[PDB]
Every structure is written in structure tokens, then in C-alpha cells.
């Protein structure tokens with residue numbers, strides 16, 4: 001019996017090659033690897049997930065869940081041709097428990113709508129990223145750094161429990177008591193490898209007070225070293241109430257953007273040392289806001305925008321290769337900064353973002369060895385993105401960004417951030433000291449490797 005027949009028993013919506021439903025379901029944030037799945041199935045009940053997992057084993061196809069579809073390597077179209085993609089769009093369950101300070105979120109939510117739901121419900125938030133079309137599933141399972149993360153942690157740190165359909169079909173619950181091994185794996189290594197997460201229970205945070213957004217911006221190739229050195233020096237002493245990220249690109253633009261959890265009249269002592277050592281005359285924008293306004297400002301919408309915009313942020317696409325790396329304190333040497341900026345300037349149509357971690361952050365204050373997310377001792381992470389609109393530049397842009405990564409590697413660590421997934425990173429760089437434990441758990445919960453992709457947790461230990 002075929003795949004069409006098996007999935008019709010479950011009753012979920014499907015889409016199969018050659019149809020227009022299948023063509024529009026192929027949308028992905030990165031359009032570089034236009035992987036062609038066997039079929040798309042759109043579950044709305046747990047049993048329909050169980051059907052898809054059963055049906056893929058019976059027909060002998062691969063299967064991956066898809067949330068928001070932002071995977072930088074297209075792993076949510078499978079990472080190869082001929083996979084059953086289980087698009088979790090129908091899991092939008094929501095509920096907020098004010099007393100427990102917890103929220104139940106379905107694995108098909110997007111960051112935009114989730115922010116709105118959580119604000120309307122009780123003026124609370126999870127510390128997620130700033131791209132509103134990003135699905136909570138991939139984001140939370142791989143880490144998740146946002147502009148409140150230095151106070152409240154990573155999204156992954158605020159997972160209290162998950163429920164997933166396992167490879168053998170059982171509906172499983174993982175939390176600090178039930179199934180600790182699986183609960184450990186999914187906070188950091190949860191993408192695809194251990195099954196299909198259907199819902200999260202998040203620890204949520206009060207953001208009813210006013211916050212302050214700030215951004216200092218330049219457009220001058222000559223001040224890049226100075227502005228970046230001042231960011232590093234400043235970065236080492238930022239208290240947890242600020243989360244900030246630095247931006248740089250080959251056209252000469254540089255900026256510092258951040259969010260202070262506090263009143264705007266308290267801000268200047270906290271950003272004074274950055275401005276003093278940065279170049280003069282920064283484009284200065286400081287604004288006091290409530291939380292939903294901040295989410296909008298952080299995605300280039302003016303603060304007067306209707307909050308309901310978050311339910312309908314347009315899904316945009318790119319075609320790019322992306323790499324990441326971590327940098328430990330006190331940062332890159334002065335030679336490393338020059339080497340980095342020079343490498344960057346040999347190219348164009350690329351951008352580089354530096355999310356601040358640091359020793360004051362909730363992120364680095366976790367006890368090591370209690371999650372699959374291991375990057376608890378860096379100053380910041382570097383996101384490296386090189387884009388193209390014409391396929392003739394794909395080789396030059398991919399070599400450009402890979403050279404850049406090698407230049408910086410001399411001056412930094414060999415770890416990288418798994419939400420900026422990169423097919424050319426060894427798994428040791430994502431999981432390090434916790435990889436053995438992840439592989440043991442992979443053997444236990446999926447011995448047949450039903451759930452795999454080019455960077456899924458393997459079944460074979462390193463000797």
C-alpha cells in the first residue's frame with residue numbers, strides 16, 4: 001500500500017508532488033536547497049502525528065517535522081529529497097497559568113503570534129528571538145537567544161516540559177521528573193532527532209513594566225574597528241537587564257542594538273562606556289516602550305503600529321549560506337578584530353550579528369552539564385550570513401563566508417550555535433562534552449533511526 005492510502009486513514013490534510021498545495025508548501029526561509037519531499041501532511045491531532053510516524057515506517061521514507069521553516073540548512077524539508085514533512089501548523093494550543101507562571105504552547109506557534117498571545121493574557125513573555133515568523137519549535141529546541149535572554153535565559157532554558165510522539169508511536173512526556181534523559185536531550189538538541197514535539201510548557205516572565213529600546217548606528221567603513229572594540233570592552237560588564245547585539249556589514253554599516261528592562265532615564269550610565277569609546281556622532285535612538293511595542297520596534301515596525309500586526313508578519317525568503325562561532329571573553333584580540341573586518345571587506349552582500357552572552361547573563365549562569373545546550377561560557381556568538389539572488393554567485397559567496405569563518409577561528413573557539421545550523425560543522429562543535437549522552441539517548445528513543453537528517457544525533461558512539 002502507498003503513502004497516499006496510509007495517510008488517508010489518519011484523515012489529516014495532505015499534499016503530494018505535482019499539485020498546487022504541494023508547491024506552496026515547499027516555502028522555506030532559505031531557498032537554496034529546494035528539497036522535494038515525498039509528501040506534506042498537516043496534523044491537527046496527536047493521533048494524526050502517530051499516523052504519519054507509523055506511515056513513514058511502513059512505506060520506508062524518511063520523516064521530519066516542520067515548525068516555522070527557518071532552518072538555515074532546509075532541514076525541515078528533510079535535508080534530502082523524498083521525505084515526509086510533518087508540518088505542525090495545526091498545533092496552536094495556548095493557555096496561561098498566572099499562578100504557576102507557566103504557559104502551554106503548541107509546537108506550531110510562530111514567535112510573533114506567541115508574543116501577542118502571551119502579552120494579551122497576562123503581560124508575560126518567554127525570552128525568544130526577534131524574527132516574528134520563526135516557529136517556536138525549532139527555535140526552542142536549539143537554544144533561542146532574544147533581547148530579554150540575558151535576564152530570563154534562552155528559550156530552551158525556559159522549557160519545563162514537552163510532549164512528543166516517539167519513533168515507536170508512544171506519546172511521551174519529558175520534564176525534570178518523567179524521562180530526565182529525554183528532557184535533557186530536547187533542551188538544545190531537540191530538533192527532529194528524538195521525535196515530533198507536539199507541545200511545550202514554558203516558564204514565563206513578567207514584562208508589565210516599561211522597557212527601553214536603544215540603537216546606535218554608523219555608516220562609515222573607517223570606524224568599524226573602533227566601534228567593535230568598544231562593544232567588546234562594554235560587553236564584558238553589561239548587567240542582566242540589558243541584552244544587546246552588534247551588527248556589521250561590508251557596506252560600512254555598524255550598530256549596537258539593545259533592550260534595557262528598566263526606565264529610559266536609568267539607561268545612560270549603563271551605555272555610557274560604550275559610547276565613549278565608540279566613534280563620535282552615532283545615530284542616536286532611545287525610546288521607552290511596553291513589551292509588545294518593543295517586539296514591533298525590534299523588527300523595524302514603528303512603535304505606533306497596531307499590535308495585531310504580529311499575527312500577520314509577512315514571510316520573506318532569502319538564498320544564503322550561514323555560519324556561526326562563539327568567542328570567549330575578553331573577546332577577539334586587536335589583531336583578530338582587524339583580521340575579521342578585513343576578511344569581511346573582501347566581499348559583499350553579507351551581514352554579521354554578534355549576540356551578547358557574558359558572565360552576568362542568565363545564559364552563562366546555568367550549571368553546566370544540565371542541558372544539551374553547552375555554550376555557557378562565551379562573551380558572544382557571531383552569526384555570519386552571505387546571500388545571493390543569482391545562482392552564479394553561490395560558489396563565490398559560500399567560499400567568502402567559509403573563508404571568513406576560518407579567519408575568525410584562529411582568534412576564537414571552535415564551538416558554534418546550533419540554531420544557525422551549518423552542514424560543515426562537526427557535531428562536536430555543537431554538542432561537545434554532552435555528545436556521548438545525546439547518542440546514548442538517541443539509541444534508547446529511536447534505535448531504527450526513524451528520525452534523521454544530515455545532522456541528526458548519530459547511533460554510533462565515537463570510539
Ligand SMILES: *Cc1cc2c(nc3c(=O)[nH]c(=O)nc-3n2C[C@H](O)[C@H](O)[C@H](O)COP(=O)(O)OP(=O)(O)OC[C@H]2O[C@@H](n3cnc4c(N)ncnc43)[C@H](O)[C@@H]2O)c(*)c1C
Pocket residue numbers: 029064065066067068069070071072075076088107128129130131133134135136137138139141142143144145146190191192193195196197198419420
Ligand atoms: C529565519 C530566521 C531565523 C532566526 C532569526 N533570528 C534569530 C534570533 O533572533 N535568535 C535565535 O536564537 N535564532 C534566530 N534565528 C534562527 C532560529 O532560531 C532557527 O532558524 C530555528 O531553529 C528555526 O526554527 P523553526 O522556525 O521551527 O524552523 P524549522 O525549519 O521548521 O525547524 C528547525 C529544525 O527543528 C526541527 N523541528 C521543527 N519542528 C519540530 C518539532 N515540532 N518537533 C521536533 N523537531 C522539530 C526541524 O525538523 C529542523 O531540524 C530570524 C529569522 C528571519
Ligand SMILES: *[C@@H]1O[C@H](CO)[C@@H](O)[C@H](O)[C@H]1NC(C)=O
Pocket residue numbers: 166168169170444445
Ligand atoms: C516505546 O518505547 C518506550 C521507551 O523505550 C516504552 O516505554 C514504550 O512502552 C514503547 N512502546 C511500544 C514498544 O509500543
